[PDB]
Amino acid sequence: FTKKEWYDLKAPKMFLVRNFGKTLVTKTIGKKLATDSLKGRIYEVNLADLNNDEDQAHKKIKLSCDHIINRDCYTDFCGLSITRDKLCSLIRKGYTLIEGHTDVKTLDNYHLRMFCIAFTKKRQNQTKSTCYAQTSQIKKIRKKMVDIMTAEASKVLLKDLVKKFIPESIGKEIEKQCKKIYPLQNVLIRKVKILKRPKLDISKLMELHT
Amino acid sequence: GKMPEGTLICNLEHRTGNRGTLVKASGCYATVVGQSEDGKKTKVRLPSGAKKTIDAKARAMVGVVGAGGRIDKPILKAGVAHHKYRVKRNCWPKVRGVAMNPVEHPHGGGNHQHIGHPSTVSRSAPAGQKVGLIAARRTGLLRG
Amino acid sequence: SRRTKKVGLTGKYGTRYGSSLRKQIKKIELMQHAKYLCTFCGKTATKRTCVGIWKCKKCKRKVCGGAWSLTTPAAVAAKSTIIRL
Amino acid sequence: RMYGKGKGISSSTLPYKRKQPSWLKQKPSEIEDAIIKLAKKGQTPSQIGATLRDNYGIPQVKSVTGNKILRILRAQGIATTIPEDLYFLIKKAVSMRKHLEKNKKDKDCKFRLILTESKIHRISRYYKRKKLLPSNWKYQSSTASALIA
Amino acid sequence: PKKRRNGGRSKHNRGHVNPLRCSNCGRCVPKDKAIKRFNIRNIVDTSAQRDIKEASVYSTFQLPKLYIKQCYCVSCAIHSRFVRVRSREQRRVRK
Amino acid sequence: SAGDNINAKLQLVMKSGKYQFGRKSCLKALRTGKGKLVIVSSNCPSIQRSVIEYYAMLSKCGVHDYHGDNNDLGTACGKLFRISCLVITDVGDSDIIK
Amino acid sequence: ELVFGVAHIFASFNDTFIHVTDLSGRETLVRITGGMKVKADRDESSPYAAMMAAQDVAARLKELGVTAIHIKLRASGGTKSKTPGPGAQSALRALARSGLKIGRIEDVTPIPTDSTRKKSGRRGRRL
RNA sequence: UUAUCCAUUUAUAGGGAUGAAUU
RNA sequence: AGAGGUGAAAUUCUUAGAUUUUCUGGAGACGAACAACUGCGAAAGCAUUUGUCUAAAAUACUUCCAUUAAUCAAGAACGAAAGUUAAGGGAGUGAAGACGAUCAGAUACCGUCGUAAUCUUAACCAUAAACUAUGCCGACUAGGUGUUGGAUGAAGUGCUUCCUUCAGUACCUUAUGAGAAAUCAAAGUCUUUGGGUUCU
RNA sequence: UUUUUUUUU
Structure with a gap:
């Protein structure tokens, strides 16, 4: 209505724009606080608009408003998702699909679950219409990829996890090590979700956001 | 208000301090189906199928009352019913009111053993009138 | 040999009561008294002790349970959900 | 196949050479002196031939010695x-x-x-x-x- | 009269195939018998695609497609003016 | 395969190496160190279990807690009773050591 | 000062919902539907109602202040249907024609890994 | 919450991070 | 201030805020897209992940027994769905049923709701267009295109392809083969009639 | 969206 006021939104310092838009906040009257109504809400942004490049248009980031100072909402990473339209664009007949998922533990005691798509590579000399994979190598590669993902996520924090998600650095070494077992086409991480986040530590967010 | 929603509880305390008031019959349980955002209030579903709002400080046992399914086996004979009610009350045997004399029961009397008047009595009926189906909203077989 | 072809334990009831009623307690007689398995000893020898009280033949330690079973399908599920947390 | 379907002709085709090969200078004496030795160790005769032909390199025990393998486990009361x-x-x-x-x-x-x-x-x-x-x-x-x- | 050699389905070395539901009528059809079309569409026809292009931003935004993979029952497929009843002699050739 | 390692290794050491079964056998072997490897039952009370595991790291013997009540090593090995505690005297050509 | 909102278009072979909210999804700004305009109990999904239900929200958005908007397209649900109704084309057309700034586009029709069986039995719809 | 009403007890410890244990 | 719904309509929900947006939980259900004239199983049937237990099949063997084989009345195991019994569960669908429309009538097709059922366990039931309508074992008879799991030789870069060959597995053409024909590489090798066997 | 019917040789 005529009373609702705009609140600018902010992104963590790692992203180069640090600002994508403004939200709307209703009447700040009575006992209802117009600070927790703004707080604990989800903003769904696209990496393409958030980094001013068209390369990162196939995935999107969810930012949860963790805390508010003055008026600018600072938000924080809470979930990652790729666009299902790009997922189904990637999906095609003749190539077997592989899924992976696990629960990881960061040094910040952050509970993260990530799901990963995996395709197979036609290469050059196959001379066949199909690129199916015998289920034993699917077994093996799913186990090995889950193991390596857990290993890489156990000894790192959440913020550097985002630092490595941005250049899709997770989708390269897996292809590198699968080249010696079974060639895989373009793969990636589909969705990452926060299961249980520790108590909100205000001291650990200022030096990251600023 | 400490346990998550969806858990099964027994020996409910419908008001903080009654040291056990609700959900106490054998095989009965309630399910916590919601917690208020600000705490201090939760919703539970009782074995009767009704939702009740109780403060979060109320206590309860987590689990299901023992000796479950007691009503499953059929009481074979009058003897088991006699022994059952002998340690409970004087509610047995019943004796139909239509088999009594008209002095002792509004159903009684007549040459054909019939009620004669509608058996759905009002909620405002006095002590000697509240004898049939008390303030019945409907009658007959249910359809779900 | 085999005296009762189908009636089994309900032979103590003779011809009294309904056939379907005796057969409905035939769903429960084979398990109210049956030797089920205890979880503190390991012999399939538990016996009915009361309406809710239960006991095997080794432990001499009673357990609250179902009316005529050591565990009830509701109570195993309820325990499983609690354990999962 | 006795049960189910599928022919499955996979098997072992013995060579036409009925006697021992020329290179088989290993004498039938010590060839016989290698089967009961592995037998009383505890070993099925179906695998005794396999281990003889894998490690000792002595296939067709019937060809190398004029007797069958279970015959030469059965003549001495160890079968x-x-x-x-x-x-x-x-x-x-x-x-x-x-x-x-x-x-x-x-x-x-x-x-x-x-x-x-x-x-x-x-x-x-x-x-x-x-x-x-x-x-x-x-x-x-x-x-x-x-x-x- | 054994109209088709395959009997109208592509089932071989199988006893049962889990079925699916037709999109337009909901009829339960075995998966190998249903007429399946992986439909690729434009959410906007090119005439208005030019409009959204000129009213959009980034100066290079490209239209993402729609991926349906619809299924039809046989009874409704021929009424949908897609499946040809065609001829007996040329019934055999598929592609 | 994971539990097959324990099951098959036990079954094979029974036949190849010398073996014994019983809580009395285990106490007799583990009051001298003859019992090479010692197993504690999950079902058995912790009072039973923790003294038997106690014996192991005085004896420098490997103790493992078998999830179960009475099975396999008490049913499949040679016996039909509730074993509730296991120990091995001697080892043959078995990799049970690791 | 450029500002971004998100508009959800819902096409289900009936009234085309237009639901314009901020970029959080929360705190809706204007909801217009398709049946808000035609009183004939018809053309709810038709471009007739669909595109005239969009220049009005364009004007409302103009007087509110927000200019740049994303779009999320919805085709019924996970059991009812999968293709957007006739109203989506006209909804896009009117937003394009109004001069309203259009940003990124996405389809968020709920796709079930589940297979909860739909209306009608095995025989299916007979009409 | 002070009128008023209800519940509990021996009116028995201010808010946040199958063994015992009294002088 | 509408929303569901329909060829229309109506029943129904909706100022106590329906539909719609987002987040959080709970419940039961299913396991799409991958997913195929592809795999496994005696058939019925069997698709999220991981673990355990158990089996089966093919391949390779210069491992072993040496006829231990095939088909089988009686007799047995399993046997879709629906249904019965009894508990638990009950989201969605939904025989019965309740309404609302069409119809001359509609007890039906269409719409809304809806009990049993559908789901789990423990027992019954033993039937399906349980269908490749084609019983099982064995020998032989033709080319090509595929494809699944091995095995062999060679060659694009330890990796990966082509040749050959087994066990499946379908498809196209051909029959001086068959059939009444449709069609069949078996439904052929049958008046040039007899490989063995069970059932009808 | 609806469309039932047509003695006997």
């Missing part, structure tokens, strides 16, 4: 009373029943138990027809576990 095939079938049946004892919903598995029980019964009948298997021997399923000996 088991229950034949190898029957023993390997009753161990399979014992595992079958140990599994089905706790897992009673495994209906395909108990169908396979029926199949192997029929196999055991007919093979035991055949071995009974020969004098090497006692006529009193019955293969009661209850004592199948102890029948391994």
Whole structure:
């Protein structure tokens, strides 16, 4: 209505724009606080608009408003998702699909679950219409990829996890090590979700956001 | 208000301090189906199928009352019913009111053993009138 | 040999009561008294002790349970959900 | 195949050379002096030939010595009373029943138990027809576990 | 009269195939018998695609497609003016 | 395969190496160190279990807690009773050590 | 000062919902539907109602202040249907024609890994 | 919450991070 | 201030805020897209992940037994769905039923709701267009295109392709083969009539 | 969206 006021939104310092838009906040009257109504809400942004490049248009980031100072909402990473339209664009007949998922533990005691798509590579000399994979190598590669993902996520924090998600650095070494077992086409991480986040530590967010 | 929603509880305390008031019959349980955002209030579903709002400080046992399914086996004979009610009350045997004399029961009397008047009595009926189906909203077989 | 072809334990009831009623307690007689398995000893020898009280033949330690079973399908599920947390 | 479908011609084709090959300078004496040695260690005759031909490199024991392998385990009283095939079938049946004892919903598995029980019964009948298997021997399923000996 | 050699389905070395539901009528059809079309569409026809292009931003935004993979029952497929009844002799050739 | 390692290794050491079964056998072997490897039952009370595991790291013997009540090593090995505690005297050509 | 909102278009072979909210999804700004305009109990999904239900929200958005908007397209649900109704084309057309700034586009029709069986039995719809 | 009403007890410890244990 | 719904309509929900947006939980259900004239199983049937138990098949063997084989009345195991019994569960669908429209009538097709059922367990029931309508074992008779799991030789870069060959597995053409024909590489090798066997 | 019917040789 005529009373609702705009609140600018902010992104963590790692992203180069640090600002994508403004939200709307209703009447700040009575006992209802117009600070927790703004707080604990989800903003769904696209990496393409958030980094001013068209390369990162196939995935999107969810930012949860963790805390508010003055008026600018600072938000924080809470979930990652790729666009299902790009997922189904990637999906095609003749190539077997592989899924992976696990629960990881960061040094910040952050509970993260990530799901990963995996395709197979036609290469050059196959001379066949199909690129199916015998289920034993699917077994093996799913186990090995889950193991390596857990290993890489156990000894790192959440913020550097985002630092490595941005250049899709997770989708390269897996292809590198699968080249010696079974060639895989373009793969990636589909969705990452926060299961249980520790108590909100205000001291650990200022030096990251600023 | 400490346990998550969806858990099964027994020996409910419908008001903080009654040291056990609700959900106490054998095989009965309630399910916590919601917690208020600000705490201090939760919703539970009782074995009767009704939702009740109780403060979060109320206590309860987590689990299901023992000796479950007691009503499953059929009481074979009058003897088991006699022994059952002998340690409970004087509610047995019943004796139909239509088999009594008209002095002792509004159903009684007549040459054909019939009620004669509608058996759905009002909620405002006095002590000697509240004898049939008390303030019945409907009658007959249910359809779900 | 085999005296009762189908009636089994309900032979103590003779011809009294309904056939379907005796057969409905035939769903429960084979398990109210049956030797089920205890979880503190390991012999399939538990016996009915009361309406809710239960006991095997080794432990001499009673357990609250179902009316005529050591565990009830509701109570195993309820325990499983609690354990999962 | 006795049960199911599929021909499955995979097998071992013995060579035409009835005698020992020219390179087989290893004498039949010490060739015979290598089978009971591995036998009383505890080893099935179906694998004794395999280990002889893999490590000692002495295939066709019948060709190298004018006697069969079970003949040269049987001439000296070291052969088991229950034949190898029957023993390997009753161990399979014992595992079958140990599994089905706790897992009673495994209906395909108990169908396979029926199949192997029929196999055991007919093979035991055949071995009974020969004098090497006692006529009193019955293969009661209850004592199948102890029948391994 | 054994109209088709395959009997109208592509089932071989199988006893049962889990079925699916037709999109337009909901009729339960076996998966190998249903007429399946992986439909690729434009959410906007090119005439208005030019409009959204000129009213959009980034100066290079490209239209993402729609991926349906619809299924039809046989009874409704021929009424949907897609499946040809065609001829007996040329019935055999598929592609 | 994971539990097959324990099951098959035990079954094979029974036949190859010398073996014994019983809580009395275990106490007799583990009051001298003869019992090479010692197993404690999950079902058995912790009072039973923790003294038997106590014996192991005085004896420098490997103790493992078998999840179960009465099975396999008490049913499949040679016996039909509730074993509730296991120990091995001697080892043959078995990799049970690791 | 450029500002971004998100508009959800819902096409289900009936009234085309237009639901314009901020970029959080929360705190809706204007909801217009398709049946808000035609009183004939018809053309709810038709471009007739669909595109005239969009220049009005364009004007409302103009007087509110927000200019740049993303779009999320919805085709019924996970059981009812999968293709957007006739109203989506006209909804896009009117937003394009109004001069309203259009940003990124996405389809968020709920796709079930589940297979909860739909209306009608095995025989299916007979009409 | 002070009128008023209800519940509990021996009116028995201010808010946040199958063994015992009294002088 | 509408929303569901329909060829229309109506029943129904909706100022106590329906539909719609987002987040959080709970419940039961299913396991799409991958997913195929592809795999496994005696058939019925069997698709999220991982673990355990158990089996089966093919391949390779210069491992072993040596006829231990095939088909089988009786007799047995399993046997879709629906249904019965009894508990638990009950989201969605939904025989019965309740309404609302069409119709001359509509007890039906269409719409809304809706009990049993569908789901789990423990027992029964033993039937399906349980269908490739084609019983099982064995020998032989033709080319090509595929494809699944091995095995062999060679060659694009330890990796990966082509040749050959087994066990499946379908498809196209051909029959001086068959059939009444449709069609069949078996439904052929049958008046040039007899490989063995069970059922009808 | 609806469309029932047509003695006997």
